[PDB]
Protein: Circadian clock protein kinase KaiC
Amino acid sequence: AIAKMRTMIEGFDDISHGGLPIGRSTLVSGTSGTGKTLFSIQFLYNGIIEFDEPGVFVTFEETPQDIIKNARSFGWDLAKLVDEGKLFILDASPGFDLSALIERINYAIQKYRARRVSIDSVTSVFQQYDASSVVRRELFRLVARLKQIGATTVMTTERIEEYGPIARYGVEEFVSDNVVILRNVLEGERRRRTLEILKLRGTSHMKGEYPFTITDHGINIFPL
Amino acid sequence: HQAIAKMRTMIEGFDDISHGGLPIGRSTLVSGTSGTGKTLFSIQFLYNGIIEFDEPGVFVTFEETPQDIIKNARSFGWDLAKLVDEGKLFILDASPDPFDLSALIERINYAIQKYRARRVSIDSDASSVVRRELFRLVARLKQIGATTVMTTERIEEYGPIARYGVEEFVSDNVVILRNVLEGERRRRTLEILKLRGTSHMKGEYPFTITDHGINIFPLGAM
Amino acid sequence: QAIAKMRTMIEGFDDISHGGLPIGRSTLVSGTSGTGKTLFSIQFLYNGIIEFDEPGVFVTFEETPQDIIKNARSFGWDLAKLVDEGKLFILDASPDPEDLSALIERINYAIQKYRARRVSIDSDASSVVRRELFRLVARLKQIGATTVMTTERIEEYGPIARYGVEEFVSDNVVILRNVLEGERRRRTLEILKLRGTSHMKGEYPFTITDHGINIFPLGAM
Amino acid sequence: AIAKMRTMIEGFDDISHGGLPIGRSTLVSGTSGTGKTLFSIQFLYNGIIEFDEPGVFVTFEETPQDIIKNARSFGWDLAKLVDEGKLFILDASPGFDLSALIERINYAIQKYRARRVSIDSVTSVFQQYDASSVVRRELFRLVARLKQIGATTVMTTERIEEYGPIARYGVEEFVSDNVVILRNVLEGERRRRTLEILKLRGTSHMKGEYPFTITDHGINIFPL
Amino acid sequence: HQAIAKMRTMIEGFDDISHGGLPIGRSTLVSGTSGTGKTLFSIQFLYNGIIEFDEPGVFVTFEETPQDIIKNARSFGWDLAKLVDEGKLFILDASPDPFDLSALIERINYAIQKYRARRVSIDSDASSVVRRELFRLVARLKQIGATTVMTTERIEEYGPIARYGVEEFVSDNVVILRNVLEGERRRRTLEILKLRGTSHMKGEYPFTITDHGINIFPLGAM
Amino acid sequence: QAIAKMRTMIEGFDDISHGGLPIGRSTLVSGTSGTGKTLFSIQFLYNGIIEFDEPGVFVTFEETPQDIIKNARSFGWDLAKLVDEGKLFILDASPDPEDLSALIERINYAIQKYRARRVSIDSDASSVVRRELFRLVARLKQIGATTVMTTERIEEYGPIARYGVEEFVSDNVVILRNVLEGERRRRTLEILKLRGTSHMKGEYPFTITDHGINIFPLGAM
Ligand SMILES: Nc1ncnc2c1ncn2[C@@H]1O[C@H](COP(=O)(O)OP(=O)(O)NP(=O)(O)O)[C@@H](O)[C@H]1O
Ligand SMILES: Nc1ncnc2c1ncn2[C@@H]1O[C@H](COP(=O)(O)OP(=O)(O)NP(=O)(O)O)[C@@H](O)[C@H]1O
Ligand SMILES: Nc1ncnc2c1ncn2[C@@H]1O[C@H](COP(=O)(O)OP(=O)(O)NP(=O)(O)O)[C@@H](O)[C@H]1O
Ligand SMILES: Nc1ncnc2c1ncn2[C@@H]1O[C@H](COP(=O)(O)OP(=O)(O)NP(=O)(O)O)[C@@H](O)[C@H]1O
Ligand SMILES: Nc1ncnc2c1ncn2[C@@H]1O[C@H](COP(=O)(O)OP(=O)(O)NP(=O)(O)O)[C@@H](O)[C@H]1O
Ligand SMILES: Nc1ncnc2c1ncn2[C@@H]1O[C@H](COP(=O)(O)OP(=O)(O)NP(=O)(O)O)[C@@H](O)[C@H]1O
Ligand SMILES: [Cl-]
Ligand SMILES: [Cl-]
Ligand SMILES: [Cl-]
Ligand SMILES: [Cl-]
Ligand SMILES: [Cl-]
Ligand SMILES: [Cl-]
Ligand SMILES: [Mg+2]
Ligand SMILES: [Mg+2]
Ligand SMILES: [Mg+2]
Ligand SMILES: [Mg+2]
Ligand SMILES: [Mg+2]
Ligand SMILES: [Mg+2]
Structure:
């Protein structure tokens, strides 16, 4: 019914029954340090390395140089992909309206013939601009235009509780076709990472929380 | 003359729980957190009305495009495109362009009249204003004579019925879809909280979503 | 010397209240949605009429008279007949799709016109709510009405009613609950308070059936 | 160290080690239907019957006629005490300033030579007048002037949780010399009434919750 | 030259828990719900300073009148009237008449100078403003060289340290008095949360209030 | 290729962080009152100076330099000597009893003057807080400083910091807890996150003694 794109992130394409729905956005929400940026980098990296699908990474608060430096933790050379024209890192770092940003993103997608897009994290621009009032409207604008473009998008968001609202403004999951929750639960002085696919409109997926670890090779999910 | 009559949904298990289906000529609120099956329920209500009883339906969408409603319904082997082309289903696009309630209600009445519709699904910041506006909608749908499913959002599995804390009190009928997380596993359940002027089963009934749509099971099952 | 009470004839209730509702006073009936508030308030009037020939005035704020009448047919009650016979008056204060003191005067006009002994009223700042609810309860008391007034609440074991004041201005308070535990619902009724008189304490389970509300003994089911 | 006045309410003078501190105010707080008005009526009634100490009852929302009628539940004839000049029921029923009310109360105390005063409930006037802003200030005014007068006062207040703040505005206990909490706890579908003396400045008292019942004879506390 | 020195309170048990008493020349916040023993603690601090060490004290009261402070202290057999008449204790009446902080601080400094006081007790709506103003007071008391107990209110036994959520962060030293209700019984406990630049015992220590004042006991006692 | 780290020499910490704090970045250290935040931040500079001759700048917002110095004598540290020798600079931003970008320029002036490699910063609308904290972290990064910045929180197992944003703009996050259970306190340290590198997970108990912070093994005591 709906076609999916392989993420090649260990375990994820099993949990999602094939990968992420093509041409749609997937919200990846989680508290700080849960692995959201990593998930969004792996998504682009694997598309390039495994499938020669170019990617655009939109960063708000982290600098492109820090994204590149941090990815060396995993032995991934993103500078080389940028040099080869296969990755573009769009720096979106400092009435509220995402129209201008959407034009920039669209330019990059057409220029680099990108099939994958990662946006990390649009929560920060809403919050820095004090734009909670229009989050539902502007996220809708962004999600809708990315769909018109045909991009397959990972969109990260913040949340402040492990078991609580999906995201910070309490509306983000409802305008998203697809929702993944990363958790980092503290119990008995120990942390455990888990991943959940809450929803994929129009298709099936495994349910509940699945454990994962972050290693030198990135995210490893165990699809019990 | 007699107590209220019901219209069969044909959603497996639901007509048992509702003691006959949804109260005719009224609206039923179906509330749930994200991914609980709300849009599915409202689609299945229309689809079954068309296939089983040749009762035309109007689907009102506020954020999903008609194309995506049609695409997603193929997950269950339902061909909504065929139904739209036969004039049995009309998808009213009220989604924004990548709010006027009176204008909306007029469009809905227009569609109900044009397509002879007997079923309607509507899917989906002061609580005082929400109460007044939802009341107007419910009341005018009842004047038109529609049997309606209207979905609403909620945030917590075992908190308020719906986002604003008022929606269930202006509704005649309320169904709650939950997606309960316990010990890392999810369990879907459906509950008929209330049907004014008629009987229904009580409590949460477990259900699944499969290639066949929603299938509801007996109490404490699964 | 006690407070005089009028029988509700609602199965079990007149035992729990030790004689029924205090006459000439208002009783708050609070509950989450679908707990039986409107039913309790209709059954109070209906029984008043059928058992005692005591006329009743039903004040509706959101449901229409025709829907009230239709819904009561669930219980085999013919409210339309009672309106035709002048025994029941349904005052429609529900808004048209498409002022407190004024409403009170229409209520009093109805009470005097129909010589009603029973009144049911069904159903954003706590200060204003407290002041206006006090004026309504006080005016009904001066009129001599015995009143059931319903209110909303949003949690089964939280505040008595939405604004956190409603129970303090009421002489009498009844709480209807619909408790969800282990995927099952259990309806319970509690008389929290009756000023000046006695009543059973705590929660009593009840059912709603074809014959209305039926309240059961302690710790039952 | 500080002299106390017997309440003669069954069990209470044991819990308070002698009764209420003379010349001071005692806050009696509780959720609705916990017995606050009853406690405040018994305090005056017993002063009159047992000790020929006249009393003034200040009522805000309940009418004097209802106070009198309700007290017949217990076989107490308050109309007769009013007729004999031993009880005065002051009807205080409908910038915020209790000065005028305080003058009325003072007039009644002097006129009737009252030793006991019950005020039930000043919470309602604060709330009806939307005067949360000045609760601490105005309660202080009232408590201080009653102390200057020499009255021994029971002052009831509302609260909305059994285990939670002492009173509605979160300040009332701090301007009171003495604090009593009435609770009506629901557990396992059963209610239990308890009374606690939280604090009596400058003197001793029993601690914790003590069970009580309300009967035809009024409040019965069991001072375990 | 060396780490901070302490002044003995002589409150039974307290100087053990504080590893020597209260840090000299600083303020110690003593926070508690109503009836926890805050005023008692602050009175005992001065009284013991006078009786045991001939160190004069100033008591600043904001709501209890001096007459009532004196009256209530007779519960413990303490004759504060005698101490005021000997010029060893001064009760500064800052209570309202049945707010100017700079003016208050000047009066406190005046009293400290007039009576040669070495100990001070102060007893007792935007959190930002409270933070700034409390900071000014603490800082100016430290400039004067007072060793001070300052009491504050709190609402919950195991919630915020104090009413506004900022008071402990501008204090050098924090003591929490609790009155914990469990199974219908109350248990009083005292905790030294923090003393900057010095050591102290940790956790809650049970205490009683009796005719002798506050008596603190070893851990897990009673 | 890893992220380079600088050793804190705080007992146990450099093991938990797998080498120390990421160089040229800021580390958030959040905690309720009296959890050891100022101590952690002083020990970071002190060890930098004593172990590695790396000068440090301490920015204080409420405690005075003289109190910082007095309090450190608890640990047998002579900070006054280090200020005299030009190895430690305490920037006083505390208010006098009786503008972000400006503060940043005074910090940078201090860093350049004293050739500091280490910086500690100690310590009402979430939007504004997020924007200003981002500007500070970004400017410190451009300057090249390795920074410890303390923040407050009010619950041991609640939000990381007061405004619910502080941890998201930080590259590195450490949480100090002081957990009260059964009338006993237990101090724990947690490294929540270090962008781009590895670290041990969960809570590690620690003590504060005459020698500063000592962090213990897993599940200890
Ligand atoms: N080589 C590695 N081995 C193990 N864990 C690693 C490694 N590199 C990074 N990590 C972990 O990955 C985490 C970073 O994940 P990241 O994807 O930046 O989280 P995030 O959710 O985007 N954080 P934030 O943006 O602040 O909300 C670090 O906190 C480390 O715990
Ligand atoms: N063929 C299928 N088999 C199993 N599950 C499916 C299938 N198709 C869809 N689903 C599930 O149905 C869910 C979507 O249901 P849907 O009715 O769109 O939820 P919703 O409550 O309307 N979500 P939202 O609009 O965000 O409030 C997905 O999240 C999948 O879990
Ligand atoms: N014949 C019947 N048998 C059993 N239950 C019935 C019958 N008729 C109605 N009910 C129940 O009565 C409930 C309606 O009670 P009602 O008195 O309308 O509640 P309420 O508290 O006033 N609801 P609301 O005003 O919408 O918040 C329905 O939800 C059914 O569960
Ligand atoms: N004769 C009696 N026998 C037993 N209980 C009685 C009797 N008379 C009254 N009661 C109880 O006393 C309660 C009234 O107590 P009352 O002192 O009015 O409470 P309150 O706390 O002042 N209520 P409120 O003013 O609404 O906050 C009633 O709710 C009954 O439960
Ligand atoms: N002789 C005594 N024996 C036993 N307990 C006593 C004695 N004298 C006083 N008390 C107790 O001490 C408590 C008063 O302590 P106090 O120091 O005034 O509390 P506080 O915390 O200052 N109250 P508040 O000002 O409302 O915040 C009383 O509530 C009694 O329980
Ligand atoms: N020599 C010592 N031995 C043991 N503990 C000590 C010693 N010196 C100080 N402490 C402890 O260290 C704590 C102060 O730590 P500090 O680093 O000031 O905490 P903080 O989190 O910065 N406090 P604050 O800024 O007031 O919220 C004191 O409360 C003592 O418990
Ligand atoms: Cl991991
Ligand atoms: Cl399922
Ligand atoms: Cl039932
Ligand atoms: Cl009782
Ligand atoms: Cl004690
Ligand atoms: Cl320690
Ligand atoms: Mg990130
Ligand atoms: Mg949907
Ligand atoms: Mg109703
Ligand atoms: Mg009362
Ligand atoms: Mg005090
Ligand atoms: Mg500090």
